[PDB]
Every structure is written in structure tokens, then in C-alpha cells.
Amino acid sequence: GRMHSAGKGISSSAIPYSRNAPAWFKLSSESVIEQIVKYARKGLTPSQIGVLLRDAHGVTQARVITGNKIMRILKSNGLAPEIPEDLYYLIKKAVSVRKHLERNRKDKDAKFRLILIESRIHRLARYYRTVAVLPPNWKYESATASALVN
Amino acid sequence: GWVPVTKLGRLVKAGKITTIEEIFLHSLPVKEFQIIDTLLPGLQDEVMNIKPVQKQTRAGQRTRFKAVVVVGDSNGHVGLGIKTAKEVAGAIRAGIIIAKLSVIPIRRGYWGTNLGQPHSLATKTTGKCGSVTVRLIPAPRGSGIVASPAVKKLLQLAGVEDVYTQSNGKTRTLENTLKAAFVAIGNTYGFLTPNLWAEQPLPVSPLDIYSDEASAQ
Amino acid sequence: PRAPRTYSKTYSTPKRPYESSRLDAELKLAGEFGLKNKKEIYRISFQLSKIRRAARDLLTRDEKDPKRLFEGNALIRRLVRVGVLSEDKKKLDYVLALKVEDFLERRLQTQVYKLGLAKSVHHARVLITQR
Amino acid sequence: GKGKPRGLNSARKLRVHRRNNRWAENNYKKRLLGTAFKSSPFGGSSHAKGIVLEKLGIESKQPNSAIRKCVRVQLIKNGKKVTAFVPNDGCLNFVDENDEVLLAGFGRKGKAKGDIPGVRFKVVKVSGVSLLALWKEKKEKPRS
Amino acid sequence: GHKSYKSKHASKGALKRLYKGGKPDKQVS
Amino acid sequence: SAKSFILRKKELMKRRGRKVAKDSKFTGRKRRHRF
Amino acid sequence: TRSSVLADALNAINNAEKTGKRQVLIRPSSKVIIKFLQVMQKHGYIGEFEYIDDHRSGKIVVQLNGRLNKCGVISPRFNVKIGDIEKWTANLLPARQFGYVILTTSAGIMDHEEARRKHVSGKILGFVY
RNA sequence: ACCCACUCGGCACCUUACGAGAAAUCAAAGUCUUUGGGUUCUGGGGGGAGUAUGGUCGCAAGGCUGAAACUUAAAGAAUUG
RNA sequence: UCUUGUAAUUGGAAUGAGUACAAUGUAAAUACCUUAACGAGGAACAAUUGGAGGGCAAGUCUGGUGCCAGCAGCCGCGGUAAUUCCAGCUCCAAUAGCGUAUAUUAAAGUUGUUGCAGUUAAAAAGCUCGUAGUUGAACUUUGGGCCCGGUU
């Protein structure tokens, strides 16, 4: 089930059992790599890059066509963000909910939800700092993290 | 003189059916107790318990007699009889009738290696009837039927010689224990062994073959 | 500061003391062989229990085990030398199948009655005691 | 499942959990507190010796009744006081004050044969001779 | 009728209807 | 009350179908006195 | 979560046996489930099984034929010294002449009588009779 | 908006026992004497007793943790009138 | 026509518990081993300890004492919260031992790793987060061929 909830949904994707080369695609293998480079130069997060690729140009996903995932292409060209996508979005969520809680001092639901979001951030950040993506301390604080995200 | 009233009654009356394994294998049902008497003789009887039971009406108090008895000759064929009648001897007769009507067999075995006319079971088996559980464990040669004397008498009439019996549950009652032990030895016969993995000829229910001389008059 | 002489007890009291089948069989044996009390039946039962325990944990050991070979051969040779098993029953499933009468048959009073010379087992025993 | 740990490396949890559970035992609790040395009448012993402090005719009922009546004795090592059942009648004429009696425990009770309220110390000896042998005229009670 | 309320320790409610009508522990060294 | 207790707990045995001893002038008596 | 795939694989086979089905589907597969089912197939207790291959971890279709009494897993995989083996059998097998308890030794995945013929022992895995 | 057929995820339902139970009953209380998927808390006859003492949070009310001596053979589910 | 039981029926055998020359034994002795002589006719040379409604084996026994606002009337009958108030007979078990007390162990799956239980019988924190602790999806050399050589 969910990590912090009682729900047990299973909505997801399902990659096809075909590891090669969609037949009608027949376009290129590197040209899509410079649209990766171009979109990353624009500043989009890798999930956004994947969804715009499969909505616009017929790329199913980059792992099957290019032979590489999106992040290793972005890191290869050196456009990789400092902290990854998901931790950054979690920090942004925590920041916004703390500003609202700062304005509205009686909202117990936001206090509970913020404790949940903080614990989720802590689990993910501990995973990252034990796999050598963050510096081995990285000290997630409650206030200065605002300047970390925006 | 007994007159057949059913299909297997006509089957056994003329003596065309003699081997009891044809009855057991296809599970031929029986509703009259005379079939086993005309088929298997010598079935020694012994009484478990006869007790008065009271049914209370608006004004009266009817007293009946519940009789439980057992039947088994000496060799792997057992029957238990629960009846309730209006008279003690009639209750014994009805109980032994239903006990001879519900005879089940027993597949015996050796505790360890195979040698010389099996004496015990072939599998540790459970039997449950209302918070009593009889667990039957095979035992070595000449180890004695280590059970309660009623249950020891039950397996002594059965045909086995040495069975360890760890029984768990409130054993102050008798009827629950005897029903649980009956189900235990029944499922002991029902517990499959790989020795029966050989190809079996699969008969076509030989009442079909003998349908010319077992039908209606 | 001297060693102990080791000691044990050859008899064993039964678990359920009061069982009419057990009391009847004990008294039947006592009449049939002329014993003094129930300690003799208990002692033969203890000897038989030891022998059957040895036989059980020898048979649970695999076939052709050298320990099984040596200890089983010694046990069977011993129990045919005393003459409880027969001559042609030199296998362990038979020594699982031993009875107490098969041991009391090989005593002294039973032999000095069975060989004549006494005409009664009680007379046999009192003729033993009188040297 | 079943509500207990089952890992291969969980043995410490099983040990400690068993220790606490065993602290909710009865005989273990009585034993490892050593309370058979502090509050028990006997000091964990089997018998004890005492001086008969007072004798009272506690009959079963009013005169047409059963003669099972007895005394209060003072322990000689502890200094404690307890009631201590004299057995079958005709032995009360053996027992008066200051007789140096030897007491044991009682044991069982049924629906007859003595269901006395908590008097659980049958007297074994009086004056250091016996009580059963004194009952069968085998010996005589010495004069002081 | 009605089944009685079941508790190993008596309720603080029932004890109020019951109750209306210094030295520490010893440890011998 | 010993005789009444034996009377109470003997008739129950017959309802269960269990053999019980017969009654006489030996039921509610001290079979063996203690010490 | 699914803390053991051998456990639920064996449980699924046993529920399909108790009900009276003919073939059963197991998700996911494993090397040890394949080898367990290999031994059980070799001793005849099941029918024949076939590994459906997708890229994730696969599934197994086991074609039963009855004649299997019980299969189960002994977790945790206790260490089993060789002299302990007999004791383990006497704990959880219906008799001694029939039934098997399955070891994972360094000489492979293999039942107890072959574990005695090859004269090796290791961890326990489960049992079948 | 409605109907029809699917599918995922919810809240309850009706019937049954292939199973389980002391019983009422229960798709879980099933897959448990044929007993081992992962894990946390709790319980060991009734009273004495949530009592005594100590610690601890609490302005107070109080809560949290929480015995021992002693005594005692006793203290859930249905049917029957 | 050959086998068991009974009897205030009967007969002769045997033998050590004991006594004791002696000799062995021993540091010297005692005792055991051997043995001259003596040593069994029943109250002898006599066996006890517990028990008898079921557990749990064995009374459809006998007698005595005390009370009854019960019948009879001085004989008695019956009852007797007298938990028998007291003795005897008969029977059962163990046996040169038998009982009792306290502690402990098995039966006990009432400490439960094997192996308990928590709707209602005692027992699932009011709920959620979370550190130590426990536990944690699948995959990486498989298969086939070759000989030699050991055991039933």
C-alpha cells in the first residue's frame, strides 16, 4: 500500500515486452539526444522531458531507443541538477505547506501532513546520502531549505 | 430368512459378491445392516455407553436411552454406533445395527522396515470432534496400545497392535473422544500413501455388469 | 577421598499403578512361574525396556553402519547365548518382538522344574534355596 | 506471523520476552523472590517444632457434632504463632500446654474428611516421642 | 437480561460508588 | 453433609451411564481413622 | 511485503491442491522455486511445470495431477547439521518410509535421502509428502 | 444525464461451507496435530487491587508506571421446560 | 476313568536363622567363605505398612454410644449438618519394607523456539509518524559430449 496511507491503488504504467526499436519510428538515435540536450538547456526536469518526448515526437521512451536513461544523458552532458528531481519537489511541497502553516496557526491537519512530508524527505535524503549523491551530512534544516529550493 | 430390498441386497443374497474391496473401492452405499452379516461373519460386539436422556415437554418428562456400541471382528474393519431409543436393549440393537451399517476399513502398516504381517498404522493422523483431538502415531513391535482403556479396546478390536496416542483436549467426555478417534482412523484409511501410485484398473461399477440379476422383480 | 563404587537399580515401578488388566497379568505370571513379589516382573520389564531401547536406536541408524553392525551383532549373539530368541531369528525386528515369558522361561527355577527333578515350580524354588 | 519474532538472528528478543513472561509465572515468582524465607511460617522447611500456646475446643458444630478441634502453637525458631491441627480424637488428652510438638504440612482436602478453614499443620509428634505410636499404646507420654 | 461490564481492574466509576460507602519499601541488604 | 454429598454426586454418575457402587451402612463413615 | 517467494509459491500450490484444481499460476518465480519444483517433479508429486517468460521476473504454470498430500516451507532456513537431519524428519513427516524434507546444501538443492547418500548437509528449505 | 458490457480502487450486503470454531457465528476468526510468509504490543484462576511504595509528567483535577503479604475452589456459548 | 480344592486327618523328608569345636580370614581381631556337633511342628523361628461411593483395587458387612417434641409404649422401628460418635469382621495393594511432610520433575502444548492464546472466556496501546532491533523482489556457468575408474 502507500507508504503513509491506507490506500492500495495499483495505477501505474506497463512497459511492453519489446526491448527493441519500434518499427514505425525509423527516425534516428542521436537526433533525439540533441532534443534532450535542447530541452535540458531550457531547464525542464527529466520527467517533463520524457512526457514531452512521448507526446510530441513519437519517442516511446529513451531507454529503449537511445540505449540510455535520461539522467545519464543529462549527467553525461553535465546539465544534471544538484539534488535530484523528487527530493527537490518534496522540499518545494514542504516549503509551501510550512508557509501556509506560518500564516494559519490553527490548522492541525497541515501540521500532521507536514510531519508526514518531513519524514518522507528524511527517508529519501538518507537514501541519497548513503549512496553518495549528497554530501554525507547535508543537514536538512527547517528554515534555510527554503533558499535551497527557491 | 432375510429378503433383499435393495440393489446390493440382491447382489449379496445370491452370493455373487464376496470380496469387500469391490464395495470399498467404488464406495458402494448400504442402508440395511444385513449385508455385512451375510458378507462378513464373526463380528464381535462390545458396548461403550448406555445412558438415560431426558426431553422435557410442557408438562411431561420423556426418558429415552442413548446407546453407543462398537463392532469389529479382529482385522482392519470397524464400526461405531450412536443411537437413541425408547428401550435399553432396543437401543443396543439399533446402535449395533448402525455400527454394522457404517463399517469402514483400515490400511495397516509397519512402524519401520517391512517384515512379517503388519501390526500398526502407516501415518500419524488427526481426529477432531468438539475440542478433543486424537493424534495417532505408529509404534514399534510389541510396544502395546498406549491409549485410554476404552480407546485401547477400540484399537484392539480394530486390528492394529501398537499405536502411540497423544491426545489433546478436555478428555472427561467419552462420546466426543470416540467420535474423534473414529474420524481419525477413517482419515487414516483416507490418508493417501505413494504406494498406491501404481496404475489401477478402474472398474465400471460392477453393479452395471450384474444389472441383469440385481434389478427389480 | 576415595572413589565411589557405582550403583543403580534394576527394577522400575510402573506409571499407572492400579490397572486391573495389569494386576491380573502380573498375578497370572506370578502363579505360572512362582515369584515372591512384583519386583521380578518389574526387573524383567526393565531389562526388556533397555534391550528394546537399544534395538530402536540401532534400527534408526542406517543399514550397514559399522556401529550398527558391531553393537547389533553383540546384542543378538548375547540374547541367543542366553537363549531367549531362537536359533534362526537373528534379526532386530524379532528382538523388538520379545515377551516377558520368553525371559522367565530361561531362569533357574523354570529349568529345574521343566527338566523334571521338582514336579512343581514352588518346590523347585525352595529346593534351590536349600542349596 | 503468529505474533512472535521468527528471524534467524532474533534470539535475544525471544530470550528477553521469555524472561518477562516468566516473571508473570507463579512458582517462579514465589521462588526467585525467595519469599519462602521471609513470610512463610516455615523457613522453607518441611516440619517445625513449637510450644502449644493455647488449646480451644473448635467443634465442627454445636454439641451433636464432629470432634475436630485444635490449638494455637508458637514456633520455636521463628517465634511466629499459628494454628496446628491435632489429628483424630482421643489425642487431645495427650495434648495440654507446653508439650514441644513437631508440626508438618497438611496436604489435600475433599468433600469430607476435614475441610477445616485454613488449619494446615497436622501435629506429628508430642513431647518428642510420637503421636501415632502414643495413640496405639506402643509407648507412654513421659511426665515432663 | 443485560450482560455485565467485564474488567480485570474495577472501573474508576464503580470505585467511586464503592469508596463513598510514609515509609518506603524494605530491601534487606 | 458427607452422606448428602455422596448422594448428590452418585446419582449424577448414573445419568452419564457410568457404573456406580451400591449403597449400604458403610457410605458416610470414617473408613480409616487418621493418626 | 512479499518477504518470501518460495513461501507463497508453495502455499499457492497447496491451495490449488486442496480445492481440486488442475493447474496453478505462480507469481513471481525464482531460481530456488524452479529447483524445488524440479525435485518435486522428479519424485512424481506434481505434474509438469513451465516458466512463462516476461522481462520482470516471470511466472510459473504448474500442471498438477492430484496425488500430492502437502508441501510447505520451513522459515527461517535453519542451519541443519547432518546428525540433526533425522530429528527434523521425525518432527514433521507423516512417517519415515515416505515423505521428504528438502535441504539446500553447497552440493545443491536436494532432498534428505540423497543428502545422506552424498553425505553432506546445509540449510533447510521446506518439506513435501 | 441514462442503459449495456468490461476493468481498477472503496463502503456495506445475501447465501453457502470446499474450511474453521466451545458455540453464537466468520471469505476471515479460512489456508493450524497434515502445527514455521514479516513484525510490534498484550495475557497466565478469582479476590487483596489499579491497592501500597518509589519514580515521572500535571497549576489543580489527575493521569503514566505499578507490587506484596494474606485469602480462596472456583470465577464464557447456546437449548430445555 | 486322571486332575484341582477342602479338612482342629496323618506321615515322614529338607534347610538356615541361630549356638558353636576348628580352620580360612585379619596388622591383631569382628564379620563374610567352608564346616564337627546341636538347632521346626504351630498361641513355632507368629510380617508389617497403608487403604475399601468414583478417580483408585477392594463391603446390596457386623456390633456399640448419643439426640429425636417421628410411630410404639418401656420391647422396640426409623431418622440422627453425631462432616458419623466408637470398635470388630471381610477384602484390596506394596513387601523387609510401607506411609507422611517440603522442594522439584514428567504427565502440562498452564511459559509454548519445536509448541499456547487475545470478537464474546484474562489478554490488540485512541491514532499516526519514527530511531535502535527484526525482516526484506528477481537476475550473473547452464546444458551437452568424452573417457577412465569404485560400490551394491
From Swiss-Prot, chain A:
Sorted keywords for this record are: Cytoplasm, Isopeptide bond, Phosphoprotein, Ribonucleoprotein, Ribosomal protein, Ubl conjugation
For whether the record's keyword set contains Acetylation, the answer is: no
A Gene Ontology molecular function term for this protein is: structural constituent of ribosome
- Which GO cellular component term is one of those annotated? 90S preribosome
Under SUPFAM superfamilies, the record lists: S15/NS1 RNA-binding domain
Please give the residue positions where the record annotates the modification Phosphoserine. 31
BP GO annotations: cytoplasmic translation; maturation of SSU-rRNA from tricistronic rRNA transcript (SSU-rRNA, 5.8S rRNA, LSU-rRNA)
Sum up the protein's function in the record's words. Component of the ribosome, a large ribonucleoprotein complex responsible for the synthesis of proteins in the cell. The small ribosomal subunit (SSU) binds messenger RNAs (mRNAs) and translates the encoded message by selecting cognate aminoacyl-transfer RNA (tRNA) molecules. The large subunit (LSU) contains the ribosomal catalytic site termed the peptidyl transferase center (PTC), which catalyzes the formation of peptide bonds, thereby polymerizing the amino acids delivered by tRNAs into a polypeptide chain.
Family designation: Belongs to the universal ribosomal protein uS15 family.
Quaternary state and partners of this protein?
Component of the small ribosomal subunit (SSU). Mature yeast ribosomes consist of a small (40S) and a large (60S) subunit. The 40S small subunit contains 1 molecule of ribosomal RNA (18S rRNA) and 33 different proteins (encoded by 57 genes). The large 60S subunit contains 3 rRNA molecules (25S, 5.8S and 5S rRNA) and 46 different proteins (encoded by 81 genes).
The gene from which this protein is expressed is RPS13
UniProtKB/Swiss-Prot annotation, chain C:
Does this UniProt record's set of keywords contain Methyltransferase? no
Keywords carried by this UniProt record: Cytoplasm, Isopeptide bond, Nucleus, Phosphoprotein, Ribonucleoprotein, Ribosomal protein, Ribosome biogenesis, RNA-binding, rRNA processing, rRNA-binding, Ubl conjugation
Q: Which GO terms describe its molecular function?
A: rRNA binding; structural constituent of ribosome
Disulfide cross-links:
none
Where are the annotated coiled coils located? none
- What are the subcellular locations of this protein? Cytoplasm; Nucleus, Nucleolus
Q: Offer one example of a GO biological process linked to this entry.
A: ribosomal small subunit biogenesis
**GO cellular component annotations of the record:** 90S preribosome; cytoplasm; cytosol; cytosolic small ribosomal subunit; nucleolus; nucleoplasm; small-subunit processome
| Miscellaneous comment in the UniProt entry for this protein | Present with 106000 molecules/cell in log phase SD medium. There are 2 genes for uS4 in yeast.
Q: Which family does it belong to?
A: Belongs to the universal ribosomal protein uS4 family.
What does the UniProt record say this protein does? Component of the ribosome, a large ribonucleoprotein complex responsible for the synthesis of proteins in the cell. The small ribosomal subunit (SSU) binds messenger RNAs (mRNAs) and translates the encoded message by selecting cognate aminoacyl-transfer RNA (tRNA) molecules. The large subunit (LSU) contains the ribosomal catalytic site termed the peptidyl transferase center (PTC), which catalyzes the formation of peptide bonds, thereby polymerizing the amino acids delivered by tRNAs into a polypeptide chain.
How is this protein named in the record? Small ribosomal subunit protein uS4A
| Source organism (scientific name) | Saccharomyces cerevisiae (strain ATCC 204508 / S288c) (Baker's yeast)
Taxonomic classification: Eukaryota, Fungi, Dikarya, Ascomycota, Saccharomycotina
From Swiss-Prot, chain D:
The cross-link described as Glycyl lysine isopeptide (Lys-Gly) (interchain with G-Cter in ubiquitin) comes at 55
Q: Which Pfam families match?
A: Ribosom_S12_S23
After translation, how is this protein modified?
Answer: Hydroxylation at Pro-63 affects translation termination efficiency. The stereochemistry of the 3,4-dihydroxyproline has not yet been determined.
GO terms under cellular component: cytosol; cytosolic small ribosomal subunit; ribosome
Its keywords, alphabetically, are: Cytoplasm, Hydroxylation, Isopeptide bond, Ribonucleoprotein, Ribosomal protein, Ubl conjugation
Q: Which GO terms describe its molecular function?
A: structural constituent of ribosome
Q: Its biological function?
A: Component of the ribosome, a large ribonucleoprotein complex responsible for the synthesis of proteins in the cell. The small ribosomal subunit (SSU) binds messenger RNAs (mRNAs) and translates the encoded message by selecting cognate aminoacyl-transfer RNA (tRNA) molecules. The large subunit (LSU) contains the ribosomal catalytic site termed the peptidyl transferase center (PTC), which catalyzes the formation of peptide bonds, thereby polymerizing the amino acids delivered by tRNAs into a polypeptide chain.
Family per UniProt? Belongs to the universal ribosomal protein uS12 family.
| Miscellaneous information on this protein | Present with 10600 molecules/cell in log phase SD medium.
For this entry, the protein name equals: Small ribosomal subunit protein uS12A
Source organism per UniProt:
Saccharomyces cerevisiae (strain ATCC 204508 / S288c)
Curated annotation (Swiss-Prot), chain E:
Task: Give the intrachain disulfide bonds.
Answer: none
- Where is this gene product found? Cytoplasm; Nucleus, Nucleolus
Q: Where is the composition biased (Basic residues)?
A: 1-20
Similarity annotation: Belongs to the TRAFAC class translation factor GTPase superfamily. Bms1-like GTPase family. TSR1 subfamily.
Q: What does this protein do?
A: Required for 40S ribosomal subunit synthesis. Required for normal export of the pre-40S particles from the nucleus to the cytoplasm. Its subcellular location and association with pre-40S subunitshifts from mixed cytoplasm/nucleus to all nuclear in RPS19 disruptions, suggesting it acts after the ribosomal protein.
Query: Assembly and partners?
Result: Interacts with RIO2.
Q: What more does the entry say?
A: Present with 1390 molecules/cell in log phase SD medium.
Kindly provide the name given to this protein in its UniProt entry. Ribosome biogenesis protein TSR1
Which source organism does the UniProt entry give? Saccharomyces cerevisiae (strain ATCC 204508 / S288c) (Baker's yeast)
Q: What is the lineage of its organism?
A: Eukaryota, Fungi, Dikarya, Ascomycota, Saccharomycotina
Name of the gene this protein is made from: TSR1
